[PDB]
Write a protein of this length. Structure first.
Lengths: 25, 25, 25, 25
């Protein structure tokens, strides 16, 4: 459920925050 | 609509950060 | 809802399929 | 649990394709 779903989405958004640093921004 | 809509919006957010990546590359 | 949520997730997965081609794979 | 679980699994899928990107870079 919902809470768990959201929580994935934060962890997706942490992965993407590292990704965009590794790239030029 | 709640946690549902926050889930929506954060998906869009993710789609937007991905389309920005894709265009950068 | 659910269906709409999923559908975002396919469109995330199309963005990522283009991304991984643009990169070395 | 249904569409719920498919949503789960495809999140994980996405997290996994992102962690593979992150490690590539």
């Amino acid at each position: 459920k919902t809470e768990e779903i959201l929580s994935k989405l934060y962890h997706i958004e942490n992965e993407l925050a590292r990704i965009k640093k590794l790239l030029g921004e």
